[PDB]
Ligand binder design. Structure first.
Ligand SMILES: N#CC1(CS(=O)(=O)N2Cc3ccc(Cl)cc3[C@H](C(=O)Nc3cncc4ccccc34)C2)CCC1
Ligand SMILES: N#CC1(CS(=O)(=O)N2Cc3ccc(Cl)cc3[C@H](C(=O)Nc3cncc4ccccc34)C2)CCC1
Ligand SMILES: [Cl-]
Lengths: 297, 305
């Protein structure tokens, strides 16, 4: 029993964190094989600013050991520093781009040293509600599938509302952001409907059934209601994805949708669901199945 | 900016997790130097659990009855001893991944990271707190026994908890790494229940200061309170008493924000009376009590917004 916001074990990623200094800027880098990946803003016309730089201008520190930079190149908003030593701690890995609604673990670092790990979701507005201070740039987001680390996020900046923006490991931003000090704001956000539904199934599995009702709804009627509360539309793919949890609890997805509709129109009436007075949307259907089954890495 | 429930990076602990099998029972062990630490109930059957005599059960075991697995490598057990509710298995190989460590016993209200494991394999990490009733609200399934709680301030791992059991309400009970249980609990399947739980007042206050540091002041008021009047009110909402030690501990956050502890106590009294009225504090519609004053100083900025 119990349902917590759970992150993946961070050990395979801790062994990849390094410090990258160039001039006055110090941030974090990801050392995989003989390449260190970091935000290109560590150096604006980025190609023009990069030609001036030489390999020795980039100081890379792995623990108390200085790494030698032997080459450098740019791929979108990420800088790739070729180093003379392959990371002996390089795990099995992939670079994957995630979609809004998907969750991942963040290993927050300062000066190449990991300080904390937390779980979060890519918001529908492409921002992440993280916890980062100055020096956290280059901190990474990841998932673990078997023994393979899938790197999905690299931290670049904070927006005026306190939310964060970044790129995949190929340097492509999540959202309409640019890596420069300019006027940019997060769009109006929405609630991840398929995730709230998954968390309602997690509550039923843990013995919290007060919100269940005898009613059902059509997918169209549910979406008409959900659009009025700034909830993301629920697709047939979302319904199919919730199939296993619907089979385990005996509550059809549209049956649970009628529960969600009543929760949106009436509130919780002084009651909580899994210790929360708000509807939680940062657990995917796979997160719920994994945590209520005990998958290891 | 931002405020998340943050766990310590788990890598130094992952390199210590092993699987311990005894007969039909399999659970997790903590391999530090040449010793594997695990719950002593690994020697029990489900029948034994009602009234187990661990000394009688242990004397019948030999070193080769304990199977210890570190990854895909079998460790050889060369000795065994019991210390309170923990079993210590002497192994023939020192863990080359043993970090710098300490065994610390924590007090209620203290927070720590839990690395939840099954079959000696880590599955997840989460942050939690020792409740005032000495239980923890964890996320544990069968096979998680032996999973550990820890803090990593500096590069030293301080082990503070080892998981032993789930009580009937779904909450969890366990020991420090010297085998002493937190609370009036026993490693027996006897009728035992967690005492009525209370809210960790000093932690809610710390989290209110974290909200002020992050730029939120809607809940503040023009009032102050005496410590005694605050406690008379707090007890009525099942909040733990606030002591002078708690007030002293909040001193640095009070100095950083410019809000006296007894003025922050007056905002809390008012929040308990009025609720949040559709508002949130740091993305939460409830008053959060699983961040200590030390967690807030570690996670938040040194400059108030
Ligand atoms: N807006 C804004 C702020 C950041 S900044 O103006 O100092 N800033 C401009 C900038 C422009 C482009 C790029 Cl790609 C990065 C960056 C940097 C960046 O965001 N860094 C950070 C990243 N994360 C968490 C931070 C917390 C605190 C301060 C920096 C933080 C630096 C001022 C309030 C937050
Ligand atoms: N009450 C109860 C339950 C546990 S048990 O009856 O299976 N059980 C009795 C027992 C008694 C004393 C001691 Cl020291 C250990 C133990 C064990 C124990 O708690 N294991 C576990 C530990 N953690 C999380 C679990 C979740 C699920 C099942 C086991 C879990 C075994 C049944 C619902 C939880
Ligand atoms: Cl303590």
């Amino acid at each position: 029993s119990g349902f917590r916001k759970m992150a993946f074990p961070s050990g395979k990623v801790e062994g990849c964190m390094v410090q990258v200094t160039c001039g006055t800027t110090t941030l974090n880098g990801l050392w995989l094989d003989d390449v260190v990946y970091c935000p290109r803003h560590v150096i604006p016309n980025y190609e023009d600013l990069l030609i001036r730089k030489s390999n020795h201008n980039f100081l890379v520190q792995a623990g108390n050991v200085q790494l030698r930079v032997i080459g450098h190149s740019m791929q979108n908003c990420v800088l790739k520093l070729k180093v003379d030593t392959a990371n002996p701690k390089t795990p099995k890995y992939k670079f994957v781009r995630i979609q809004p609604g998907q969750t991942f673990s963040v290993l927050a670092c300062y000066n190449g040293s990991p300080s904390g790990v937390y779980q979060c979701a890519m918001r529908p507005n492409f921002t992440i509600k993280g916890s980062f201070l100055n020096g956290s740039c280059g901190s990474v987001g990841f998932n673990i599938d078997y023994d393979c680390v899938s790197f999905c996020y690299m931290h670049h900046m904070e927006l005026p509302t306190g939310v964060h923006a970044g790129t995949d490991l190929e340097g492509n931003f999540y959202g309409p952001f640019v890596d420069r000090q300019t006027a940019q704001a997060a769009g109006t956000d929405t609630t991840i409907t398929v995730n709230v539904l998954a968390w309602l199934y997690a509550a039923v599995i843990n013995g919290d059934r007060w919100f269940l009702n005898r009613f059902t709804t059509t997918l169209n009627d549910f979406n008409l209601v959900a659009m009025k509360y700034n909830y993301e539309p629920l697709t047939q793919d979302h319904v199919d994805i919730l199939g296993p949890l619907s089979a385990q609890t005996g509550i059809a997805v549209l049956d649970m949708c009628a529960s969600l509709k009543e929760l949106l129109q009436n509130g919780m009436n002084g009651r909580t669901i899994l210790g929360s007075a708000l509807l939680e949307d940062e657990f995917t259907p796979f997160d719920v199945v994994r945590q209520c089954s005990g998958v290891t890495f």
